[PDB]
Amino acid sequence: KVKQLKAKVEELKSKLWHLKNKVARLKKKNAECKA
């Protein structure tokens, strides 16, 4: 119910935040690799 959706939102928020940090890490790795 409204409870389940709430759980999906929190899971998606957590996954989104993980992805933003991953993308920022990969951008810096690539910039450095390109020396």
Partner: protein, 35 residues
């Protein structure tokens, strides 16, 4: 309430899909530069 949460879930999933696409691309670029 459900109409609002249902909408936030769609917004979160779309941002995720784009980041996942960006991650895959960045991992590829990193693969080449590292090789």
């Amino acid at each position: 309430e459900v109409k609002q949460l249902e909408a936030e879930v769609e917004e979160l999933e779309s941002e995720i899909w784009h980041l996942e696409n960006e991650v895959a691309r960045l991992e590829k670029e990193n693969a080449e530069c590292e090789a």
